[model samples]
Target: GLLQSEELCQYILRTSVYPREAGFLKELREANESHPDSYMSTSPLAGQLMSFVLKLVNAKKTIEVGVFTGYSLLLTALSIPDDGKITAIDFDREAYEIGLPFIRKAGVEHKINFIESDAMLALDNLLQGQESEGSYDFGFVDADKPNYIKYHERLMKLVKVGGIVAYDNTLWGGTVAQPESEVPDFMKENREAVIELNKLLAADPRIEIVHLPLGDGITFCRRLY
Candidate 1:
């Protein structure tokens, strides 16, 4: 059968109401509709919600692993102080081009430092840099799932003590819970990766982890320092 009506309703509320966005976000949604994997893009509500949470925590220097169309990047940038900075990494220049105008239009361009490249490599470079004493106040990981573990490890080091790391798609469309089902090829790898990452996060003592069923399921981890 189709998805449960109640569950779909919950998704609708979460994406449309919880953290509603303004006109700029609507433009982003329209642009994302033409992307090959539109679902990979985070919802406006989720982006705005994260921005609000980051603001509440007073995040000053933030990092985003994947910046599909820069919706979330804009959200995080807007939440921080005018002088605060966001370092966003992604390889798709064209995708970012579509969103750059919106970001500039919002007048948050100065707050974002966009990097076009593989996120893992960028993260490694950041970690290996001389000023790498946990300068990031918050992080959001939504990049290639195969490197989720690596991303989490490096992000944990980059984020300041007590700062937050939001891991997106941790539930893998609920496939992580199904033991007997054969997931589609494209999803199998990511699903398995998420499952393993979840176990590692649960057992790790260095950070406090909480998995929330938000935006395809997100796991929020706070470094214990």
Candidate 2:
């Protein structure tokens, strides 16, 4: 649910998000622009919202499932305290490598533990650790769309009661609200996955949720005991 018109988006970025956008984040954003999946980089506006969420929850120990150029990861690292820690999992090591220098430049690299592994495996391993369940303060998922439901199920067990788990692209570029035939061929596959995830998230009693029309959309869910 990105704002209509490129001008409007630019307006918001110029008026709010961009001014607040940290220097390191901007550097990282530019660094990611030439990559094939540069579009996959987290939205600057959404990253701003995430920074608020991270601070609001006092997030320290966190886990993130996607690290496309590490924009959001850097945001989280900067938002949390100096001693705060994050477990960042991503399959694309090269993409993460591209963003590492910016993270280091921001002086938050020590807080992140970058892991090159499948999200499910890393999440499961975290859950298997001592006192891992319900220990994390926040969680973020921007990985594969079809596996979001699976990620939610696992995150519910990993993040503490009252903690937050945010899912990006929940609206699938507004496709979830439109007729299936209206969706572009490329977006169709993940659009359906996001559609199903939205439905399940709305009805799932284990958490309280709010959908934010930031970029594609951000589903902010708080695990409720």
Candidate 3:
């Protein structure tokens, strides 16, 4: 239901992709499958998309707000050049450790700078540091739902004009399009927050956005200011 049908999605993966996926990536996905929060891992298609975007933008310095199991972080690491750097923020160091082995196995661990703390505080600290406005080339936000707007604000200041900032799970598993009463209680708050954020992003004059239907949903915002 998310993308036409499951069969078609699998077909696309088998016929057009996956074959090109590195063996280490596949092993990493399998290792992450057993985690309780495996759902937080970026889907293969979405990971591929992000990797392509990073290369397209020639992103060398980037930030990732959430590093759950480091799936997307690995993809980013693989996409950028050998000297590329990533500031990865996550509250749970254990969760990040789960994927650290795979990252090391892939020989990309040096690209990541893991910060075990609240993403908001970490971002604020970056803003306060020598990192001037628009110093970052790219940013990926995939942490708490309620803080999506806050993350966007800080990310906008960090990413340079023409750089990209992607917000994950913007569609909230299609709950954003459903009636409030029909939405699950556990998802209500997140759905509402994502809905409001989407509307606001669409009308914002400082950036251009496109909400893609890959994974739950991913909205790419390119800075214009």
Candidate 4:
């Protein structure tokens, strides 16, 4: 809900995004809606944008951190070529299991390597492999708000030059702009983290950025190095 009007968001989704979305993706979206933390799932609006970016970059190898039910992961899987691979790292196997059926149905499960571990360790494991350095064409981050800066650091190296690295929830539902006194206790810490993350990206020399207002604010960075 980064946008001022929820109705307008719905209007945009209904009018353009959803209709253009793949049928399997729609089913996956509804399946995620039943979860208790459904709000954490990637919205169709953001998925659409990711789909566009993935295709635009001709992404062959990619990585995703924080795949809650794998909405963005699925979208990435759907976007890449039949041989393209995605290394999806997350600790919540159950959440990923919920989406596994749809992923199988969509015939993209073969493209994903679901890693059951914390992101930092998993990313580090990839870093240890010489061939993995700057091997990925795209990387998507949407989990663990506080560690986003850390993820960005690793992804900058994982994704090759001219590759794309997109971060989700940059606005933290507009909470990043709210004063500390106004922010709720639950959101204050993450808000502060997101604020720091925004500044880090603003000053980062390795990538060029465009932070868009779509889906809780997504910041897309293209590696210039």
Candidate 5:
């Protein structure tokens, strides 16, 4: 995989600050080391930077659409205020189990609601309640690629008018601009999904969208009231 740009690398190295020996972070890294699908987990540095930004924004209520190994969840919990909560959704209990102990150890397990089920369905359940509208202050989407569009559509309503939504893996490993003939089927599918989502977000008058070339290309959509 391509590494971060020189500018971003330097920025993180020099400016980013995070708990170096936090038990939850340390254990999450160890668990990722033993997991077979460890590649699905976010880099600790990236998680720290993401959470730092959320804290800078003073985000209170947050949602994570994917919780592989709970690295990002741990980051969010550590960064947010003690009273804040994160509603995380993922279907893989086996993968999540690896991080449960770390979460308990961190003592922020009370701040998280880890839902073991399909993220799409779980998101719908969140959207169905009357109080669901404009409830989340921040959201991170990093689950199935094909459902990126659907997730954004639902999240736009779930996130408050001034809230922000960060969509991860939008670059699809630098395949978004690759020629159709050169891209593999899976990547091509992801490319199409991200391209479509990007365009829709750009033209949507309800939000102010910025396509950031961060970790795997994250697109940040800030809702406009």
Candidate 6:
């Protein structure tokens, strides 16, 4: 119940988190506030957690399924070493371009390979390419919710055994645990999809999962075999 209140969450950030955040990251978050769908941008806490994970795992080669305004991608870029690489896939070039200048300002642009295409197709291409299977150290899935299961299937093959694939918004704002009748019409489909994916991930024997209640809810899956 520590983060049960909005004031408490803000307190955590103000007292411990935001002070350590890089100036560029702070600026990027502010810049994204003007966007219509700024909510789609990754939260500062989630970004920091992702950065920590990348460093902890010494991730060098990574892939991100969603690159909305590239905040998460920037976090990954900043965490990896100079020779490290990240493949960022997103369908909307305009949204990614909006964050291009910020990424350049952060000076981690060279580490990212921006791909404008469907994430499913991109994963398929990676699978088709030689040496792709089990070649990546990390993967992040934050794209369309309906495709969460599909993305997991592809990521299982793309990430090496013991590597991590983090799925964002898995809790669907706590709706996954709510009664079906309580969910709003527009959110029903996504909530149900998340619930199904959560069960699937938990039951799968190939990966180990931990559902963290941070930043809308992120589920970290580590490939076991």
User: What are the clashing pairs of model 5?
Assistant: none
lDDT of 6 at 182: 90
- The lDDT ranking, best first, is 2, 4, 3, 6, 1, 5
Against the true structure, candidate 4 reaches a TM-score of: 0.98
lDDT per residue as tens, model 3, 1-225: 368789998987887669877777888888899998798898788888898899898999999999998888888999999999999999999888888998999999999999999998999988986664688899999999899999889999999999999999989988999989998899999998999999989999999999998888999999999
Candidate 3: where is the Cα deviation over 4 Å? none
Q: Write the per-residue lDDT of candidate 5 for residues 1-225, one digit (tens) a residue.
A: 446466666656456533353667877878788988887776555565577679778998999998988888888888889999899999988888898888888888889988988988898998886877789999999898889888988898899988989888777778877788888886777889888887888898988877766557777788886
TM-score, per-candidate, Cα-based: 0.90, 0.97, 0.97, 0.98, 0.87, 0.97
| Better candidate by TM-score, 1 or 3 | 3
- After best superposition, candidate 6 residue 49: deviation in angstroms? 1.5
* Candidate 2 to truth, TM: 0.97
Give the per-residue lDDT of model 4 (tens digit) for 1-225.
Answer: 766688998999999998888888888889998999998988789889889888887899999999988789888999999999999999999999988898999999999999999999999899996988899999999889999999998998999999999999998878888777888899888899999999999999888999988888899999999
lDDT tens digits by residue: candidate 6, 119-181 = 899899989967788999999999999999999999999999999999998888788888989
Each prediction's total of clashing residue pairs, residues at least 3 apart in sequence or on different chains, is 0, 1, 0, 0, 0, 0
Off by over 4 Å in 6: none
Candidate 5 lands at a TM-score of 0.87
**Predictions in order: lDDT:** 0.82, 0.91, 0.90, 0.90, 0.81, 0.89
In candidate 3, where is summed lDDT lowest over 10 consecutive residues? 127-136
Better of 1 and 6 by TM-score: 6
Query: What is the lDDT for 155 in model 3?
Result: 94
After aligning candidate 2 to the native by TM-score, how far in Å is the CA of 32 from where it should be?
Answer: 0.7
lDDT of 2 at 135: 89
lDDT of 2 by residue, 126-145 (tens): 88867789889999999999
lDDT of 1 at 223: 96
